[PDB]
Design a protein around this nucleic acid. Sequence first.
RNA 1: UAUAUAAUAGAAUAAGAUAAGUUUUUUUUUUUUUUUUUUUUUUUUUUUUUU
Length: 204
Amino acid sequence: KVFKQDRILKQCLDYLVESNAAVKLSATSIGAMLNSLAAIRFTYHRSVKQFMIAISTEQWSEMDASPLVKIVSAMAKLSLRLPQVLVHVGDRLLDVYTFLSPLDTALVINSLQSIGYGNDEVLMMLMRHAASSARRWDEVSLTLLFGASGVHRLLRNVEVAAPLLEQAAGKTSSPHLRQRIAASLRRSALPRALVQSSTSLLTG
RNA sequence: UAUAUAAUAGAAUAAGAUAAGUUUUUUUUUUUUUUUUUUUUUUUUUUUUUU
């Protein structure tokens, strides 16, 4: 109902952490609660922060990827940049990155870019995984990836970008996105020949 | 097995009439002219005294 009554939800979110019930909860329930709290633009951020801190190391060690992406998306849309939880997410993503679907990779890239996460090697490995499945990407994933804030830094290597560049021209059809990607190409480390050739078809 | 992301800049320079909001001696000095009073000098007239 998009019912904004945050002074009521604050009581429930205080109870969740007062009774130490934030640790035994199932991961999927957490990934749904936080995503819902990121839908009405919750205000009392400190309570959500204390809720995030409670969950221990054991829980993050073996969470499935599908609730993990929901949790990171809820953190990003809530504009949270907790330091010691991003390292947990980063090292946990090492073992399950192959299992991510193309939509999940597209979501994760921009969700991490929007929270100021600066561990370059994990974003590079995510970009490599995305380029591996380049033929398997649809329009929505292209919008979520190429429309990310500051994607120019993630266009670093030649072999990690070209594999998806074509698909981008072939599939997406909104002219605004075409001009956005054409403008973003100019601020990377790609060579001039490749940039010129890509913009020869991209702009339109 | 998902319904959705959005940020780039430049300049140095002036006109000009609206029927409006106090008042608190008047006096001192210098020069010229006229009138009145006092003093001094000269001339004329009258009276008294002396030679």
